[PDB]
Amino acid sequence: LPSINPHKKTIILSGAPNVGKSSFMNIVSRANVDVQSYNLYVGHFDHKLNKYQIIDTPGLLDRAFENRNTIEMTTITALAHINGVILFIIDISEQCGLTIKEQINLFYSIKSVFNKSIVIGFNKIDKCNSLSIDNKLLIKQILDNVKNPIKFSSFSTLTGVGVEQAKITACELLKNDQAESILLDQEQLLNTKL
Ligand SMILES: Nc1nc2c(ncn2[C@@H]2O[C@H](COP(=O)(O)OP(=O)(O)O)[C@@H](O)[C@H]2O)c(=O)[nH]1
């Protein structure tokens, strides 16, 4: 809503407070970041001759929607209608102050506003690897509960390892969705004609 181009290819960052969202944005955009107020953050980067933005909205996409007022919801909804892929980051070290299960609960609670592609980012691997079987099966359950096309990416925004890889899989998930969706529109229009 505040000075965002809705047509530019976008990574929409989401996840609990202190999971590494602002860190991720800063790394991939080399801090080429516009600070906009309603604070909303828009990082910019190029990948493979294409221009991208990456958006971080602390206070909006880091907590459940139950407590939002109308204006906040319209802002959230406006973001959900951008040309974007979601990067939902889970801090698997739990240093953010919430357990993996509480972070997955957050994901289910808010993934309904987005049917876009989603990358689940497992961050802070410098402080982890492995996981409880209930946690691994909770993560696996995401693939069953979710109609959205979903990929996984592990990284550390403290050490840099896997970060660029995570950025690459987000972009390509977007491409594939753009490709699949334009076909459905082309098909419906011809099926109408015929
Ligand atoms: N151990 C570790 N700490 C991290 C990593 N990435 C970020 N942090 C720290 O986690 C805290 C929150 O990170 P931040 O980017 O502000 O998360 P955000 O609130 O979601 O935007 C900060 O103290 C960061 O320095 C990581 O990969 N590993």
Question: Which DSSP letter does residue 162 get?
Answer: T
Task: Give yes or no for residue 51 CB within 6 A of ligand 1.
Answer: no
Task: Give yes or no for residue 160 CB within 6 A of ligand 1.
Answer: no
Residues 6+ apart with CB under 8 A from 39: 58
Pocket test for ligand 1, best of 11, 23, 40 (most atoms within 8 A of CB): 23
| Cα-to-centroid distance, 124 and ligand 1 (Å) | 8
Longest dimension (CA), the chain: 58
Experimental method: X-ray
Residue located nearest, by CA, to atom 11 of ligand 1:
18
Runs of H (alpha helix) within the chain: 21-28, 70-80, 100-110, 133-145, 163-193
Q: What is the number of the ligand 1 atom nearest to the C-alpha of 16?
A: 20
Residue 131, phi then psi, degrees to nearest 5: -85, 155
> How far, in Å, CA of 34 to CA of 2, rounded?
11
Q: Which domains can be identified in the chain, with CATH numbers?
A: 1-194 (3.40.50.300)
- Quick check: 106 and 30 in contact, CB under 8 A? no
Residue 176 burial by Cβ neighbours in a 10 Å radius (0-12, 13-18, 19+):
middle
> How far, in Å, CA of 71 to CA of 86, rounded?
21
| Cα-to-centroid distance, 82 and ligand 1 (Å) | 26
